[PDB]
Amino acid sequence: AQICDEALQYAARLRELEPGWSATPGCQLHDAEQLWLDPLRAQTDETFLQRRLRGDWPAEVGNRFANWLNRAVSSDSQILGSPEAAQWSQELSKELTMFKEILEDERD
Amino acid sequence: LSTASVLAFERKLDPSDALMSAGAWAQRDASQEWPAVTVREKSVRGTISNRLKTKDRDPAKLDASIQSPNLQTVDVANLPSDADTLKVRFTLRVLGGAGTPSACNDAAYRDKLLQTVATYVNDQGFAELARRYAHNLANARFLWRNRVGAEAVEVRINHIRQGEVARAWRFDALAIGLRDFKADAELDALAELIASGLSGSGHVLLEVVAFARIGDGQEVFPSQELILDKGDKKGQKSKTLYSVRDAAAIHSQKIGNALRTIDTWYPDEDGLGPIAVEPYGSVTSQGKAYRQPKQKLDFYTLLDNWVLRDEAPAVEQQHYVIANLIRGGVFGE
Amino acid sequence: LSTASVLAFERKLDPSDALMSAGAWAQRDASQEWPAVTVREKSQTVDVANLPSDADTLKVRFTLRVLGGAGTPSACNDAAYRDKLLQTVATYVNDQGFAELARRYAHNLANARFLWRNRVGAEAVEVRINHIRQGEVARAWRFDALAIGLRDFKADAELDALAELIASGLSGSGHVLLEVVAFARIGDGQEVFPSQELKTLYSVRDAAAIHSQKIGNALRTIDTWYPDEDGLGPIAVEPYGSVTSQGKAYRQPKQKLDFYTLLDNWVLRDEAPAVEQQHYVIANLIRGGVFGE
Amino acid sequence: VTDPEALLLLPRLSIQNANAISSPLTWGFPSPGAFTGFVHALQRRVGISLDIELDGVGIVCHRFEAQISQPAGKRTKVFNLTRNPLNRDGSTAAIVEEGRAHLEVSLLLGVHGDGLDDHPAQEIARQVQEQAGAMRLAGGSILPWCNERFPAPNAELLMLGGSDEQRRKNQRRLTRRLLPGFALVSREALLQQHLETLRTTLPEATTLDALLDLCRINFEPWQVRDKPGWLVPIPAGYNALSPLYLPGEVRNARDRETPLRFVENLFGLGEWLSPHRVAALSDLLWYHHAEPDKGLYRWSTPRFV
RNA sequence: CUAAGAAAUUCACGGCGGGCUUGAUGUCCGCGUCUACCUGGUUCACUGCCGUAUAGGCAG
């Protein structure tokens, strides 16, 4: 629950005081980062694209964050047979459920 | 005795990557310069028809998904629209010497294993396994999706010693079944060659060419390449086909899978088709693992109980153990 | 007992791409070698597809390979769910063949729906259909596409003989390969409608063409078994049957007519739908796709 | 401690030269008594004219920049002073030390009065910010905006009515505009918890905060003692050490019509939290409350848990 | 109705001379990535226009 909100702290600091954010410097694997941590700009900037005007379900970067949360724990081999990782999967599940709903209104 | 902590067997029956080319049928006797199947891309728009999410039964959420379709860029591989035959060509090389590992810690466990395998070979050669590998060269098992739904499939196998065909073979891959391994006066001419290759008595290099009439402008199915993230759906995020030097090709390990599907032995299948020879013998598409480790038919169970504890398995299962040493692997601990 | 998490169904009735070529009407005798239709520009830079002005007839040609064996999934986790799925189709096929399905498939080749925006506005459309057991044609056909109704399905002894061929392919009785050739009077130098690339046009040998899946969408408008209304004509057989141009869907999961809800009843829950509803269940197994959990 | 009807939001208050000493012991962010006395000064000036009750106050603190420097070789950090005008003789001035910190806070409020029913929502938020521009929060000025004009307007949520869905989606709109900060509450119960935990010895309440302003590198039975949050020492209030005087019997008062007591400060515990952690934002408010019979004069966040 | 209320640290400066980082090394061995799809949601609210004047066989 700290990390679910620390990323939100990381989101708003990157959102604030950077209006000139764009995709052109150094993009190799940064998909939908223009969609979630965008500059709102009071306008859209698009020519051969329609996605920039609005936004719905920015969840794949949250799933990639959820794929990072499985990578965040380093190594534990005795947790798979126990239901502790099944409890941790619920810990992964009950915090993304809060995380997706918070993440909606930045684009919904 | 104890097992070596590292065992590394180099593989035998080492295939190559098969190119694909197309042409007209009855020009297959002069298929020296057919044009290769080129991978090309197209634009695919499809609706959202998938397994429904839990507690998501809202009809407007269905209807809003119609307003957001799936613009999607794939690549495909069709034949030239005048051609109907698919020429697939690769070169299989038989190495031989399946007993000796590359890396091995214990010198005593190595020397016991070499006496164990040489006991097998002198009692019975590789001609039982080479009877079974010759069928997967006979029937076009390496035509994975392309064989399904064909009028005629014809397989030509050439033995090349120098840069010259020493002996040809001519096979009808549809008359020969896909499940049953019947003997032949023509298959045993090719099975004695592979058994001589695996035993190390000579050199075997086979040129495998398989023709298959499909139709005018239909679709061939090369192996599919893993895709990294590059942005949105446009940019071939969906599907990328394997191609080397602009020719739609099949991976070698897919063909190397399709050769070693000889294991008709099982826990619980009488005649339901052979499985690929795997430790923990499994099928990725079927999802289930036959030959479970709690069952004693496991490769790691049978091998350790024959080299350390020195009792023979069933001869029914002894042909399984040697076939896992021909494909190689990272064995041991 | 339950559906497997992986259900991949290899599709059947596999089409190809459709080459386009011009030519004059009543030149159908020597109609083999035509010049095709290229993709040029006009100015702001767009890509248009037009006939050579001396010709009036679009020629469309693709091939169709009827595979059959519609019950077996290509990938399935559990075998008991796999076996009873094969038992359920064996219940279907023994009770009735693929004939009523294929007779509705026999229409979509005759009245050329694969001429999507080309049939509307035409005045004379003729479709050739040939069965090729070898390189030779073993069985030929000849069908008007405007006399056979686009919105209403009617039977014919020529169609039913063609329907039994596609029924023989889907049941696995043999090999069925088809050569569909469509001549259509549109006019001199008119705008034909190829498939729209994501904006160029889909050309292959610099010859403008239609996608293969955009033809197969036209060969499966069989589902007249709506929840709501058959008055709008047939619609392509899809799970959660929906049309992008009309915008709305049909066959909601709140309705009990959903393909997933039907399949769980017809296989797992042993609850048979109507015989008219059974044809919708099988015609998505010919479509194929990733099913299950 | 009355439950608020509305929630007035002061969006991004940039604060120049605020105080940073805040107690005789706890340097840093200024005292929460400065914020509770600030809202009572708005209730003094505005809330009697709009007929509203401004009682609670939330603390967000988007940016804290203190004027400190550590000297060469030390690790403790000393303050930056300022010059003063000279003496009568013009020799030099004596040195007093005053901490000094720039600051950027946001202030939730609580409204109770009938002026919500009379004045519209924009009229409430306009009269407050136009007054609060020409005032002082922690002994320092309040600065206006320039060059991008984005964070200027206020907000107000009538969180008295509506269904629990209508609150909770609207509540997630304030947490957007409070997101780069860190909300501040008092934890009076954790200090009561760890005193009863530390009963192997006989410690004091002041000896517990020294074990919460910690880096207790514990030797193995090496390791660092864990923290359940960003626990921090705050001044909790005041505690009187003198009897209650008549208004006209103490020399050099501010005014001669209010009673006086000499008090101490009074130290407590506080935790800095993200605004998405707390479920109900009305629990976040600081309420000054005091019983004048004995000597307590404190402030806290009630109803928090 | 605020640990309330008030406040100029300033001026000036040479961092600089010198330097051998070397020697040697086996990354091995094994693998199935599959299954489906309408881009006819305008590639300039437009490509030529009598007068930008909702003026058109407008090429619609």
Swiss-Prot record, chain A:
Disruption phenotype: Mutants lose phage DMS3 infection-dependent inhibition of biofilm formation while there is normal biofilm formation in the absence of phage infection. Decreased production of crRNA in the presence or absence of phage. Disruption of the entire Y.pestis-subtype CRISPR region disrupts crRNA production but does not alter phage resistance (possibly OLNs PA14_33350 to PA14_33310, and the flanking CRISPR loci), indicating this CRISPR is not involved in phage resistance. CRISPR (clustered regularly interspaced short palindromic repeat) is an adaptive immune system that provides protection against mobile genetic elements (viruses, transposable elements and conjugative plasmids). CRISPR clusters contain sequences complementary to antecedent mobile elements and target invading nucleic acids. CRISPR clusters are transcribed and processed into CRISPR RNA (crRNA). Cas3 and Cascade participate in CRISPR interference, the third stage of CRISPR immunity (Potential). Involved in crRNA production or stability. In this bacteria, Y.pestis-subtype CRISPRs do not confer resistance to phage DMS3 or MP22, but instead are required for DMS3 infection-dependent inhibition of biofilm formation and possibly motility. Interacts directly with Csy2; part of the Csy ribonucleoprotein complex with a probable stoichiometry of Csy1(1),Csy2(1),Csy3(6),Cas6/Csy4(1)-crRNA(1). A Csy3(6),Cas6/Csy4(1)-crRNA(1) subcomplex is also formed. Belongs to the CRISPR-associated Csy1 family. This is CRISPR-associated protein Csy1. The gene is csy1.
